[PDB]
């Protein structure tokens, strides 16, 4: 798998990455609460259930439904299921229902270290995914994407950014991939460390993705100072059913032991 660099990475990194020592944690979950997620710190995304999500996706981002998101066993779990939830307000046609939780309008960050340490979901179809965007169109307003996989290639992860210059609308995107041991079975940390001068994403303390301030000034290149909100899914299909979808795959589960977010203060 590749995110439309077939022969190469667009913005290759080969660096460590840690928490900077002038930084403190200025946001946590630790997912230690079981049932629903603390509604402090995160909100379920609903915005395209009824209209039909992007990216020839197949899933319906159920709210508020513990069989597709839950706080189980120290983790956040997000599960993805084969059904039609057809008595939902908002349902658009789907056969699979799982769940997409992000911290719009109630946590945005402008630079700084984000780790998310997590166990993905496998399965052909499956399609996990740790991300952000701009709280103030797209893509200009920029998208960073910590963490995709898919998983009829699981153990290959995938870090990207978008912006207007640079994005899979006209496949510009600024991005790279790595392996990752059995990223279904065991814990990685998947992390961004975003400065105004670039940004590294990694998994397990080491960068293989780096993208440069290229300091012309312009918005275009460099959208990334203004506050950005963290996105967790598990979607269906689209990329993640290059090589179609295993029925036999339902349910599948993304863990996420924590996520926690540093910055200079
Ligand atoms: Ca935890």
Not at 69 to 74: D, F, H, L, P, Q
Not at 100 to 118: I, S
């Amino acid at each position: 798998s590749h995110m439309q660099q077939p022969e190469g990475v667009t913005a290759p990194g080969n660096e460590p990455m840690a928490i900077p020592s002038d930084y403190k944690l200025v946001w946590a979950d630790e997912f230690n609460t079981p049932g629903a997620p603390d509604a402090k710190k995160w909100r379920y995304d609903t915005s395209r259930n009824k209209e039909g999500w992007y990216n020839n996706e197949l899933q319906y981002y159920a709210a508020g439904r513990p069989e597709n998101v839950r706080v189980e066993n120290g983790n956040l779990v997000i599960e993805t299921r084969k059904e039609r939830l057809t008595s939902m307000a908002d349902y658009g046609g789907q056969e699979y229902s799982s769940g997409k939780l992000f911290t719009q309008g109630l946590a945005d960050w402008q630079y700084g270290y984000v780790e998310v340490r997590a166990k993905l979901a496998c399965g052909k179809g499956m399609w996990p995914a740790i991300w952000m965007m701009a709280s103030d169109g797209w893509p200009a307003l920029g998208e960073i994407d910590i963490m995709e996989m898919v998983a009829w290639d699981p153990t290959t992860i995938h870090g990207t950014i978008h912006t207007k210059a640079y994005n899979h609308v006209i496949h510009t995107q600024k991005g790279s991939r790595t392996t990752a041991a059995d990223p279904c079975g065991q814990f990685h940390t998947y992390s961004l460390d975003w400065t105004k001068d670039r940004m590294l994403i990694g998994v397990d303390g080491h960068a293989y993705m780096r993208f440069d301030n290229d300091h012309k000034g312009n918005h275009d290149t460099w959208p990334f100072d203004s506050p950005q909100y963290l996105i967790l899914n598990v979607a269906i299909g689209g990329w993640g059913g290059q090589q179609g979808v295993d029925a036999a795959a339902f349910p599948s589960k993304m863990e996420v032991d924590y996520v926690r977010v540093y910055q200079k203060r």
